[PDB]
Amino acid sequence: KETAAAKFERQHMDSSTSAASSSNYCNQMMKSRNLTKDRCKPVNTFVHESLADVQAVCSQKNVACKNGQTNCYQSYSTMSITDCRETGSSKYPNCAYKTTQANKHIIVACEGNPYVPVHFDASV
Ligand SMILES: CSC(=S)/C=C(\O)c1cccc(O)c1
Numbered sequence: 796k797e798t799a800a801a802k803f804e805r806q807h808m809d810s811s812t813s814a815a816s817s818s819n820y821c822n823q824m825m826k827s828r829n830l831t832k833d834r835c836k837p838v839n840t841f842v843h844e845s846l847a848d849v850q851a852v853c854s855q856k857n858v859a860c861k862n863g864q865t866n867c868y869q870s871y872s873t874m875s876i877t878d879c880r881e882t883g884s885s886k887y888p889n890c891a892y893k894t895t896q897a898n899k900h901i902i903v904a905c906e907g908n909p910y911v912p913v914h915f916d917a918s919v
């Protein structure tokens with residue numbers, strides 16, 4: 796029932812803050828977005844731009860996806876993001892993450908009709 800498009804919004808959209816509100820950000824957000832459910836998701840990126848701006852990336856710079864598919868797109872403008880990376884001492888169910896804020900171009904995979912983001916591939 797959760798569409799792929801909806802899952803992308805759950806995993807990767809946080810339009811509510813301009814930047815990572817705190818060294819705590821990742822611990823709180825991975826948990827509440829259900830990314831520490833069955834395992835600690837090792838790496839995950841949140842984007843702090845509007846939904847419209849992030850959906851519009853599917854019409855921007857077409858680039859190869861890390862997996863070799865052709866349906867990835869790089870943003871022309873930089874975007875405000877937060878990178879969440881599991882710590883060395885992190886142990887499920889107490890998943891712990893380092894939080895890093897940045898401004899970078901994002902790369903997303905897009906699929907469907909309508910053609911919308913479904914995976915976060917990379918930042919550059
Ligand atoms: C690491 S890629 C780099 S930083 C590229 C850009 O900023 C970029 C690329 C194409 C068009 C454009 O207008 C901007």
Ligand SMILES: [Ru+3]
Pocket residue numbers: 900
């Ligand atoms: Ru650039």
